[PDB]
């Protein structure tokens, strides 16, 4: 199971948000920390992504594009996984030192988006997602959103995507006899991956609005963050870059 050996071997480690719990919760403090966390996890993503099977085959420019357009959905997915394995999707485990309880969910002014994130978190349990399905599914997320015109080398991006889809397909097909369960498992998981997009765009909208008035609410933005939210996110929000859905 070479492909799996690789995914498991290159999975990023535990990342701390550097949040000062001793401080009273406050919109600015919570968001400033999520943005710092966002900036840190972004580093691991780039290293994780580049060590992916057949990834460096993509034109160096499409490597930036895909990473830049899909980090939100990737980070939200993993985070939903950490939540599920730690605080059992009861709360939201963004980082070891930044766990969201109902109070903080309301305090950050994103309770609505958090409710949907926690739902996703529960899905891992309800659907009994295995550690292997999670990894193949999360790889797929990286290839799940592109510009409507196409990347530098679109022909090749689609190839890589096909292979990753075929992998998630084998992961299910292994340890499973006959064929309606497989066919059924594949339907549930592609539906799960789809449900990630709607949540992602909500956060894109939220963070963009946030950055614009950041200096009014005292919320800090790291440099790659403030950079990506105004140079790549705007094109997702304006319909230039679009998610690739499995189902209609």
């Amino acid at each position: 199971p070479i492909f799996l050996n690789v995914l498991e071997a290159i999975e990023p480690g535990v990342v701390c948000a550097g949040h000062d719990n001793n401080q009273p919760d406050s919109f600015a403090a919570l968001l400033s920390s999520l943005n710092e966390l966002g900036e840190r996890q972004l580093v691991h993503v780039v290293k994780w992504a580049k060590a992916l099977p057949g990834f460096r085959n993509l034109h160096v420019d499409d490597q930036m594009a895909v990473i830049q357009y899909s980090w939100m959905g990737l980070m939200v997915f993993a985070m939903g996984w950490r939540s599920f394995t730690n605080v059992n999707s009861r709360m939201l485990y963004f980082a070891p030192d930044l766990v969201f309880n109902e109070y903080r969910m309301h305090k950050s002014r994103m309770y609505s988006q958090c409710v949907r994130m926690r739902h996703l978190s529960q899905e891992f349990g309800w659907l009994q997602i295995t550690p292997q399905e999670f990894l193949c599914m999360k790889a797929l997320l990286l290839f799940s959103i592109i510009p409507v015109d196409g990347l530098k080398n679109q022909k090749f991006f689609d190839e890589l995507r096909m292979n990753y889809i075929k992998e998630l397909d084998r992961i299910i097909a292994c340890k499973r006899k006959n064929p309606t369960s497989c066919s059924r498992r594949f339907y549930q998981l592609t539906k799960l991956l789809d449900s990630v997009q709607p949540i992602a765009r909500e956060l894109h909208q939220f963070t963009f609005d946030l950055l614009i008035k950041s200096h009014m609410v005292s919320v800090d933005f790291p440099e790659m963050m403030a950079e990506i939210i105004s140079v790549q996110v705007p094109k997702i929000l304006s319909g230039k870059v679009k998610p690739i859905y499995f189902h209609t």
Binding site: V43, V46, Q68, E223, M224, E227, I228
Partner: peptide, 10 residues
Amino acid sequence: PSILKKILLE
């Protein structure tokens, strides 16, 4: 970008 780009072509 510029800081992102560097982490990649790295």
